[PDB]
């Protein structure tokens, strides 16, 4: 079922997934919230920002009820980056690579 909440042990597996992403060589743009010194109009454009540090805090605080909610935050990190950045940018590239890695790791967690 997808309505089934995460258990305490499931939370250790999500942490492993989140940490595998933070260790990936293409994760550099997403480790921390976008710095306005690097992208002065970013928060004028992206109204629902997310980053890997924010997800880590939310995993530590047990913010997520269901795996679908965790997946929604993750997918926003990538969809925001493609919405903001042009398709030929290094950022957009990181988002394509890291999203496929996340799908491979998410299939592993689900079964």
């Amino acid at each position: 079922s997808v309505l089934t909440p995460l258990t305490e042990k499931d939370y250790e597996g999500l942490k492993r997934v989140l940490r595998s992403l933070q260790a990936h060589k293409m994760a550099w743009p997403f480790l921390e919230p976008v710095d306005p010194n690097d992208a002065p109009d970013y928060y004028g454009v992206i109204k629902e920002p997310m980053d890997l540090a924010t997800m880590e805090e939310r995993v530590q605080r047990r913010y997520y009820e269901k795996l679908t909610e965790f997946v929604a935050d993750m997918t926003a990190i990538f969809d925001n980056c493609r919405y903001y950045n042009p398709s030929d940018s290094p950022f957009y590239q990181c988002a394509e690579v890291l999203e496929s890695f996340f799908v491979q790791k998410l299939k592993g967690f689900k079964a």
Binding site: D38, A39, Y42, V45, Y84, N85, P86, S89
Partner: peptide, 8 residues
Amino acid sequence: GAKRHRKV
């Protein structure tokens, strides 16, 4: 590259 919002 520096981050800037796409226009196309």
